[PDB]
Each structure stands twice: as C-alpha cells, then as structure tokens.
Amino acid sequence: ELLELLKSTNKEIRRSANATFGFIAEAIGPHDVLVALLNNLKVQERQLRVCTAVAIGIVA
Amino acid sequence: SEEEIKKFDSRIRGILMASGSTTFTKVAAKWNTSLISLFTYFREAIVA
Amino acid sequence: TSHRPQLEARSGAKAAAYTPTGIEHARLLPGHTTLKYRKRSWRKGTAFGRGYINDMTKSEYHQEFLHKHVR
Amino acid sequence: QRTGLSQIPNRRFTLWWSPTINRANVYVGFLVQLDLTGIFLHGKIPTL
Amino acid sequence: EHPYGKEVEVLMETKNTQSPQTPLVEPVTERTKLQ
Amino acid sequence: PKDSRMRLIRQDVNLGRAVFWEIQSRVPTSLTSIKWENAFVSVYSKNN
Amino acid sequence: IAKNVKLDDFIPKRQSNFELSVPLPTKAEIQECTARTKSYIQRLVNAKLANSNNRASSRYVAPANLLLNNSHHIEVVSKQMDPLLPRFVGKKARKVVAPTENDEVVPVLHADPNEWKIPAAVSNWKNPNGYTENNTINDGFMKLSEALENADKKARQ
Amino acid sequence: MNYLEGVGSKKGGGGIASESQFNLQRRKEVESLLSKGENVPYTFQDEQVRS
Amino acid sequence: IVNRYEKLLSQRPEWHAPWKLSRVINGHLGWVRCVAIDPVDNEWFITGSNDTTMKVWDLATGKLKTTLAGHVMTVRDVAVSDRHPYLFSVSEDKTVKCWDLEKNQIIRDYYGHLSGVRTVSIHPTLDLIATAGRDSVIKLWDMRTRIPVITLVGHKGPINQVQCTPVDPQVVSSSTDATVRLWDVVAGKTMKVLTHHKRSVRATALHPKEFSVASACTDDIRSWGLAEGSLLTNFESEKTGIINTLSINQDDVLFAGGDNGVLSFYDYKSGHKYQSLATREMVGSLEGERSVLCSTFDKTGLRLITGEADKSIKIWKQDETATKESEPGLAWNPNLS
Amino acid sequence: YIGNLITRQFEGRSNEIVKTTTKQRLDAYYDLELRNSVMDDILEMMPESIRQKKARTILQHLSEAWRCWKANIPWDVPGMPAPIKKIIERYIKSKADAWVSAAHYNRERIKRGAHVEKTMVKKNLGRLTRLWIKNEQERQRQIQK
Amino acid sequence: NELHPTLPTNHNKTKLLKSLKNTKYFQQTTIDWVEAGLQLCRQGHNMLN
Amino acid sequence: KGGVWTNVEDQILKAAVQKYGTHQWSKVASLLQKKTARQSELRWNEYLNPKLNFTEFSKEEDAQLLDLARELPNQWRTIADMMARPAQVCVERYNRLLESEDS
Amino acid sequence: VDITMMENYQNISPVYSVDPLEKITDAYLDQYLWYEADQRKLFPNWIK
Ligand SMILES: [Mg+2]
C-alpha cells in the first residue's frame, strides 16, 4: 500500500512512506521488501522509480 | 382518465424494480414523490 | 461445439438395476389406470376542402403492435 | 463497489426499531442466543 | 391468391370454430340412462 | 354511467359524423392522419 | 470374404417380376405373436412393480436344477427376507463399461470441390485468440422542390 | 431482498490494478500490434528468418 | 440375366392418375412439422408445429377446430390410435404426452429420454408405444403403467423413424447411421440390419396392404419385404435430393416429399416415377422455404395432406377427368448402370 | 420421502439423472436442437468430402448470420455455395419467427399486469428496441424508393 | 368435505401390519400404553442418531 | 474539445480495427490512451475506412452535386449516400463550387 | 445520435442523447428562438 502512496503529489507523503519501508524491513527482513521494490522499477513514471530507489538505499 | 390511472400503476411497478429499491428509505421516498405528484396534479378528480 | 449427444444405452447397461436405484418419484406414482377402448360561407374558407404475407416483421399485425407499445 | 447498493442505511433503520422488530412476541418453542452475548434473537433476521 | 390462381381455396384461419371443451371423439354409451 | 353519457340518437349521431367528415377533408393526409378511431365527438341537444 | 457377402443380396427381387406378392402375415399368425409378446411385457411390468420397495404399487401385478451329471439332485428354495433390512444387499449404484457384443459384423453393401468449398468464417463481432446501395432519387423528390421554388419566387415578387 | 440488484463479486480477489500497471500493459499491446507480432532478437543472443 | 432384362419391357407399369392441388390452409406461426389423420372417421386431421402448438383441422371444409397448447419446444411427431380415444405427441423438450381426446387434456406423461424425441408409433395389437430420438435407443412404453418396459440398443446415431407391425419384426427403425434395423423385441435384439442406404435415412412408410416398408435416403428410395431382410425394388429417385417424408397409398402410389419443394409420385410395384410437381411457396417467403416436411394420405387414399416450411398446409387431389390416354406418365426408360 | 432418503444412503444417487427443460435452460436447449438440425441438412447435400473440419466452420457462419439479422445488416459471404446459403437462410428465418412472437407474447403479459421476472422484463425491452428500429429503417427505405 | 368425496378402492385389503406379522421377524405381546409409548421415544431417538 | 489525431494514433486505429473488428470499440479504446470508444468509431467511419472515397471530383460529379443540393437543400447525409462519398467532403466541395462563381 | 427506450410497461418510449458540445449550441438556440417568437408574437393565443 505504501507503494501505491508514492504516486502522491505531496512530498511529505512520499518522504514519510519511504521511512516506513525502513521500519518494516528492520522487523521482517530485507528480501521480501527488496522484491516488491525491484519490481516497481519497471513502471514508466519517474516519480515512482525515484522513490523506490530512495527506499532501496534505506533498506540497505 | 383511465389512461392516466394506468400510468400511475406502471410508475409503482417501476419503483419496485429500480436500482436502490432494496434500500428501505429510498423506496419510501419514491413512494412519496409519485404520490405527491399524483395528488397535487388531479386533486378533485381523485374523489369520484 | 457439443458435436455429439449422449447415447442412452451407456446409462441403460449400468448395474444399479433394470429399474433406477429405488427412488420413488411423485410423477411415477399410479394414476389413470384404466385404458379406454373405442367402439355555407363557413365551408368555403379553407384551402384543402372538398393480404396475408409470409413475414412476421413486415405484417399488418406487427406494425399495429409497434404503433401501440412504442407510442 | 460502483453499482451495488450500500447496506449501511438498512442497518441504521433496523437498529433504531430493533426493540419492536426483535420483540419477545409469542413463544415458538425455544429462542436462539447470540454467541458471546446474552442477546436473544426472536426471529431469523439477517440485517439485525 | 394468384400464386395458386383458379381452382384453389386459400384460407387464413386465426379463430377456433369450436369450443375448448368439445370431446373431439364422442363418448360411446352402450346403454340409455334416465337418472 | 349510461344515463349520463352521450345518447346515441340518429339526429345526433349523424351530426357527430358529419362534423368530423368536414374537418378530416380540410387537412391533407400526407401531413397527419386524422382517424375516427382516435376521435371523440360529444353532441349537446334536446336529446343530450 | 466368402461366407459373409454374396451377389444375390445386392440385387432386388421385383426387378424381374412386378407382380411378386408379399402377403399380409395372417389372422392366426398375428394372434400368436400377440399372445406371447403380451405375456412377456406383463412379466416385465410385475418384476418392475415388485422391486420398487412399495407395498402400494404391488396390487397391479420348482426344483429347476439338476446336476451336471444328474448325480445328486437340487431343490431350490428362496429365503424369506427381513422387511426392515436393505433389500438387495448387493445393490448399489455403479458404472459399468460394457464390451462389444459377440455377433460378427454385417457387410455394408453399398469441379464439385470448387463448388462445395466453404469459405472461412471471419466475424465482425468476435475475434479468436489465435490467428488474429444503388438506387437513385425518385422523381417525386425532383418535382417537389421545383414546385416549392416557384411558389417561393412568385411570393417574394 | 438483496438478490434483486444482480451484482456480484468473485471471492478472493485483490481489486483493480494500479494505473502504472495498466500503462505497462497497454504499452506492450501497442508495440505488438504495430510490429505485426514479430519477435525481435537481442544483440547478445548468438543467433526462423524474420521479415 | 440381360435376357431377363430384355423381358423387363413387357411388364409396363400400371397407370395412375396425376395429382393436383386443391386447398391451401394457413394458420401456424412456425413450420408444420408433423401430421396425423383421424384413423377411423376422417372427420379431422391434426398438425404439430415449430411454434410449439398442435391444431385440429376439419378435413372437408378446412376449418380450424381447436388448438392444443402443451409443449415448450417444437412438436416433432404425433400419433392417434385406432383402438383408443388417445393422442400421443412428442417434442424437442424430451417429453412424451398422452391426450385424452374426450376432454382435450393431457392425461399421461412419459419420462426417460435424455434428449429430444422425434418419433412416436402406436403398436397395432398391444397397448404399447415406441419412441426414439437423438439418444439412439428405442423405448417401448407400457401405455397403462407408464413404464419403459423394453429399451432397444443398436443404432449408432440418432433415430429418425420408428414403425410398428403385428408380427416379427415388431419394430422397424431408421437412423442417421444409414442403416435400417428390424427388431426382435422379446429377445431385445436386432433381427436384421439393412445396410444398403448410403446416407442418413429420414423417412419410412409401411405399405397398407402388402406388408412391406419403404425407406428413403437422399436420392435413394428402396422398398423392403418384412418377412426377410430382402430388397424388393430400387426406385428411380435420382437427382431428387433430400427426402423428408414418404407416403404409401392403398392404390400402390408412393409419395415422396423433398427439401426442394418437389412432389414426386411413384408406382410402388415397379418404382417408376410417373409425376413430378412443384409447390409455389407464398407471398413474402424465401426460396429455401419451399420444402415439404410431413405428409399423410387420408383413409380413403385420394387426398394427400402436406405441411411445409412456409407455415402452410396443402391438400392435394387426384384428377378424375384425367383418364389414361391424354395423361401418360414420365417416359418409362429403365436406364443401366 | 424417508424411503428415498434411506435408499440413497445404502445404494447411492444414480448417475443417470436426466434434467428436464425448465425456464432457466430453455434458451440453451433451443440452441442444441437448431445446431443439430442445421448440420443434418448440410451434411446430406455434401457428396463425400469431410465431416469434422468443415463442420465447426459451418456453425460459425450460422452464428454470424444471426448477429446480422439482429443488427439489421445483410449477410453476404462472397464465395459461399448457393445450397449452403439457402439452408442457413431458412433456419435463420425460423429462429427469427420464434424470437418475434415470443417478444409479443411477453409484452402482452407485462401490459396486463401479470407477474414477469425482472430479467425477463429487461430482455423484452431489448428485443422491442431492435424490432422498433427495423420498422423505422424500413419506413425510411420506402420513402426513398 | 361434502363437496369433494374421495372414495376408497375395493382392492386395497393388504394392510401393512397384517403383512408384517406374517414374517418371522415380528412377534406379539401385550403391554401398558405408557410403556409402549416410552419405547417408541427410545426407538425413534436411535433411528435419528 | 481537442480531438487531434496524430498519425501514430491513425496507425493504432487501423491495426486495432483489424484485430477487434468494427463493433468492439471498447477494445479499440483500450489500446488508445487518449481517445474514447465513440471517438474511435467516428474517425473510422468518416476518415480511415479504406473503402471511403476522398479523390478529386470529376466533371460529372459536380453536375450531380449541384443538382442534388437543390432538390434536397440541406440534407447532407442523404446527398452523401447518393454521391457515395463522405458527407464533409461533399459540403466543402459544394462551398468551393459556389465560390468558383465569384467576382 | 444515440437512442434508447424507456420502460413504461404499457408502451416503450425513445430517448435521444445528443453530443454534449452540440447541445450547448442547441440549448442557446432553443432559448433564443422562443424569446424572439414571444416578442414578435408568432404563435397565436390558442396554441398550448
Ligand atoms: Mg455470483
């Protein structure tokens, strides 16, 4: 759901949704969250690809 | 007129078949609009 | 593509019985058991004064229909 | 979700008149008790 | 009409000339009853 | 009721047919169709 | 090849003589088939009325064995069943595929392709997953607009 | 009384997909139409003769 | 053998009068699919149709007596008994219904066909009926208890026709697997398989006097003696098309009605076609709707009734003024193969 | 009733259950009878070609000729043989005869106040719209003619 | 009830309880009515279970 | 109010109509991002059907066009059925042919 | 123009849906023509 929230035209929403992927990965581990993020890189839209690239470095 | 007695009965059949006629207050609200629109149109001719 | 019905006999050779299982249907109950054997200024003022066909849709009955129920 | 009609108005109406709709009425041999409560249901009424 | 022309009866029939309760085979009573 | 309809009387019934006859001739049938089937003619007289 | 198919069975019999008489069966020969076929059908009705497990439907209805060498004797007795027990304890609904019957096979004894060629159906409404006015104006129309244009010019002048 | 309305749902579904996923679907469908469906090889794939 | 064929111009088949049309009756809303004459008095005939009804018609005047509602799909065959005041009707909705005529109501229903039923035949001496259709079996019913007492298994395709006779073979049947089977019903098995027809056999009719059956395939009409599986005659039915119905008269006239609207008359002993007519359809109907779907002769044998694909009933008549000399047949030239 | 229930417990429910023609499976059953009757009349006109491959193609022209009657469009296949064309036309007119008279029969029930289902009231208005437009197009064609 | 009489048929003298006492499996005795009815409560509860 | 068809959208229509046919316009709209089902139907019938006639008029077409436009004054869909040309082409050609009569 | 039919149970009646951008021009022209006919007294007193 946070993945669908990245299409928002607000910069707070995108910025705090990316923080939340960090907290979720610290609990349940990287690799379930990495796969959904890597598959989100295939969209056309630039906002979505730039926000999943931020989130991957947070998970790392 | 007999022609407009049948028009009113076909209106009540239409109310009991429309989308939203399962919601109880929607059905009641449509009963009130068609009953008001009948009685305020004819008014005296209903009596006899 | 149905392409073939079911032949009846592949049911009829099945070894439940000659009969069905033993279901008693309500329409197979007894009835009708006995067979029956046979032995002027106002008139001048105006300007214009003085088959059965074999098709359903092109008929006279059909166009009186569409004149009544499509108003 | 676009065409189907919302359940929430029927439930709203039914809850309001529920002590009259779910009244003790006449004895039918037994009564059904709703689990984890002591609410008795005096008919089979799904919206209630 | 003229498809058949001269010696042919063409008749269109939309009405039952009988009633919907006529035996259409008369019951045979071997005896005469007076009761 | 039958007491208070038009009384079907030859002097009156023919007058109703003649008035309609005069009016149907005045419009050419390529514009509209004026038919006796769709017409009502009420006559007021000594007998009506 | 030989024992099954012949040449007389190809050819008709009235082909030579048209006045060949095939008669009716007879009054006596129909009454003998009538008696024994009616006797077979009521045997099958009574066996089928008596196995429906109705006491109600049943109002509408021997040693028989010797030995293989006739050595001992055999008396056959039917046992009387408990009416509450499931009658025909072997009976249960089952599917049985049946083999081919034992009797041998009967002999069968019996340009245009460009005329009978069917085109391929291609629909405007539906697409399969794979392999993706002459008549002129009537003269009444001509003559209406000439009249309406004369009346228009004559009125405006 | 609900059955009068005539609208159903299949159980176990997830809903409507997102518009970035319809945009990926449509963009692939347009290319295979205009291509007439031909398979393009990749340059690295160490090579059926194409049009 | 050709010496025998040299003799074959010495028989010279018997002359029959040509037939012509007298009455055209309209009134069904679909194709007229089946017809049966009152087998006692000739006071009426009955027709079932594609519009799911049956209608009763006065024979002399042509007038409509009564309409019988009672099926939801096409009524494909009807039968009226000699011995009972009973009417048996069959439909495409898998039902067999008995009609007491004296009340004009349904009295008995017959259950058990997997699909649509096309033929019904009444047994001449027993109180038994025979039905068959797409399920490729014949069922023999008990008329009284409504029980499927016997089931005949053999045909490999849907069955088109069933006839009944007083002696063995009790039941004759013809199906879409191009065979005619003769049945021993007590043993429940086929007495004889006639394999000579090349395609689906649509029509049969029994001779009223000679104890024989005729059967028709497309372009192929053959007659059979019922005592043995023996071919009696081949008919000059070449180029005649699909045959839908067959009718045999007391005076040895075989009628063959076809899907091209062409009436075809035959002499039964020889197989010689002496007349070919053509139906005119109606006003507003299609060229495909010129076809003949059912036929029956009346009990005297001088009127032929046909119901057709243009929803009409045509009554055919034989000419009395037409003596032999100015009405010969159609050139008896018996060709070779 | 108890006899039927107890017989099913020890012997099972038969696999030879034939389901009747009821109002919910009537349109399906009309389909199968018209589809079998069209393949019979065409396969008897063919000399000795084939039975399996052409057959699916023939029933696709039939379904297409019925979508053309409903759309009021003429159905012309350019290289189709003339006797296959007259069988499909005869059977499309027979289906259309049933379709029209059932629409009149159900419209008169809806008028006289007889209880009709909601799905069947709705299917009736769809038929009477297409019938109304066909009278309207035939009215326009004649004024040109 | 007076307007629509339903007449008995003369053939039906078979009578369930007489055809059941022909077999081995049923016997007779005489008991109290309250005993007979308390048995049928026990017996019918076994059949449904 | 735009309704601008770029030439790649014309190629997507013709390929899309070759697949889905002529009655499934909502499939044909599923391939276009910016066009509706009625918008796609309208360009096929008036522009992109290859059975349409957009050529130059011959001299006997213009005498047929001035004749019809006087008998049926403004009925441009009835005239275009008789010319067997698109309606908008007949209207423009009519206006130019009246401006060939000009000072 | 699209056409659909209205269910009235005794008859059906057609409804025409015109294109929206064309409806703005037609709705202006409707208001404008009735305003001018009323100023200029086109229709006499008997027309209802
Ligand atoms: Mg569902």
Q: In angstroms, rounded to a whole number, what is the distance separating the alpha carbons of residues I265 and L89?
A: 64
| Contact criterion met (CB < 8 Å) for K25 and G59 | no
I243 φψ region: left (φ > 0), alpha (ψ -120 to 50), beta (else): beta
Q: Of the candidates J15, C11, J20, which has an alpha carbon nearest to the alpha carbon of residue I95?
A: J20
M8 Cα to the center of ligand 1, angstroms: 29
Q: Is I96 helix (H, G, I), strand (E, B) or coil?
A: strand
Are the C-beta atoms of I141 and I176 separated by less than 8 Å? no
L24 Cα to the center of ligand 1, angstroms: 25
Q: Of the candidates B11, C57, J99, which has an alpha carbon nearest to the alpha carbon of residue M10?
A: B11
| Cα K18 off chain centre by | 9
Q: In angstroms, rounded to a whole number, what is the distance separating the alpha carbons of residues I266 and I276?
A: 9
Please give the single-letter amino acid code of residue G126.
Answer: K
Q: Is J109 exposed, middle or buried (0-12, 13-18, 19+ CB in 10 A)?
A: middle
H/E stretch holding I150: strand I148-153
| Contact criterion met (CB < 8 Å) for K14 and G83 | no
Q: In this structure, what token pair is assigned to residue M27?
A: 């709705």
How far K30 CA sits from the closest chain G CA (Å)?
22
H/E stretch holding J67: helix J53-71
**Beta-ladder partners of I230:** I225
H10 Cα to the center of ligand 1, angstroms: 7
CB contacts, 8 Å: B9 with chain J: 113
Are the C-beta atoms of I79 and I45 separated by less than 8 Å? no
Q: Is I88 helix (H, G, I), strand (E, B) or coil?
A: strand
Q: Phi, psi at residue D12, to the nearest 5°? A: -60, -45
Q: Is I75 helix (H, G, I), strand (E, B) or coil?
A: strand
Q: In angstroms, rounded to a whole number, what is the distance separating the alpha carbons of residues D48 and D15?
A: 7
J22 Cα to the center of ligand 1, angstroms: 21
CA-to-CA separations, A20 to A43, G41, J79, in angstroms, rounded: 21, 85, 68
L29 has a chain H CB within 8 A of its CB: no
Please give the single-letter amino acid code of residue K22.
Answer: N
Option in L15, L30, L33 nearest H34 (CB) = L15
B10 has a chain D CB within 8 A of its CB: no
Q: In this structure, what token pair is assigned to residue E5?
A: 């022309």
Q: In this structure, what token pair is assigned to residue D7?
A: 């359940």
In chain A, the residue whose alpha carbon lies closest to the alpha carbon of H27 is: A44
Q: What is the DSSP letter of J107?
A: H
L72 has a chain G CB within 8 A of its CB: yes
Q: In this structure, what token pair is assigned to residue I75?
A: 């009524």
Q: In angstroms, rounded to a whole number, what is the distance separating the alpha carbons of residues D30 and D9?
A: 31
H/E stretch holding J27: helix J26-43
Q: Phi, psi at residue F4, to the nearest 5°? A: -120, 20
In chain I, the residue whose alpha carbon lies closest to the alpha carbon of E17 is: I65
Q: In angstroms, rounded to a whole number, what is the distance separating the alpha carbons of residues I226 and K31?
A: 72
> What was the experiment behind these coordinates?
cryo-EM
Q: Is J25 exposed, middle or buried (0-12, 13-18, 19+ CB in 10 A)?
A: exposed
Option in I111, I137, I284 nearest C27 (CB) = I111
Q: In angstroms, rounded to a whole number, what is the distance separating the alpha carbons of residues I293 and I303?
A: 17
Q: In angstroms, rounded to a whole number, what is the distance separating the alpha carbons of residues I51 and G96?
A: 41
How far K46 CA sits from the closest chain G CA (Å)?
15
| Contact criterion met (CB < 8 Å) for J118 and B17 | yes
Q: In angstroms, rounded to a whole number, what is the distance separating the alpha carbons of residues I95 and I89?
A: 8
Option in I29, I93, I289 nearest J90 (CB) = I289
Q: Do chains F and G touch (3 or more CB pairs under 8 A)?
A: no
Are the C-beta atoms of J70 and J130 separated by less than 8 Å? yes
Q: In angstroms, rounded to a whole number, what is the distance separating the alpha carbons of residues I336 and F3?
A: 90
Q: DSSP assignment of H1-51, as one string? A: -GGGS-----TT---PPPHHHHHHHHHHHHHHHHHTTPPPPPTTS------
CB contacts, 8 Å: G92 with chain J: 10-12
Q: Where are the alpha helices (DSSP H) in A1-60?
A: 11-28, 30-39, 46-59
Q: Do chains H and A touch (3 or more CB pairs under 8 A)?
A: yes
Q: Is I28 helix (H, G, I), strand (E, B) or coil?
A: coil
Q: In this structure, what token pair is assigned to residue J17?
A: 């259950």
G129 Cα to the center of ligand 1, angstroms: 26
CB contacts, 8 Å: G125 with chain L: 21, 23-24
Q: Is A60 helix (H, G, I), strand (E, B) or coil?
A: coil
Q: In angstroms, rounded to a whole number, what is the distance separating the alpha carbons of residues I88 and I122?
A: 9
Q: In angstroms, rounded to a whole number, what is the distance separating the alpha carbons of residues J143 and J41?
A: 39
Are the C-beta atoms of I325 and I45 separated by less than 8 Å? no
H5 has a chain D CB within 8 A of its CB: yes
Are the C-beta atoms of I265 and I253 separated by less than 8 Å? yes
3-state DSSP percent of chain I in helix, strand and coil, to 5: 5, 50, 50
> Given in angstroms, what resolution was this structure solved at?
2.5
| Contact criterion met (CB < 8 Å) for C5 and I153 | no
Q: Phi, psi at residue K16, to the nearest 5°? A: -30, -45
CB contacts, 8 Å: J78 with chain G: 119
Q: Residues followed by a break in chain H, C–N over 2.5 Å?
A: 47
J141 has a chain G CB within 8 A of its CB: no
Using an 8 Å CB-CB cutoff, list residues of chain J that contact chain C.
Answer: 3-4, 7-8, 11-16, 32, 35-36, 55-56, 59, 96-97, 100-101, 104, 107, 111, 128, 131-132, 134-135, 138
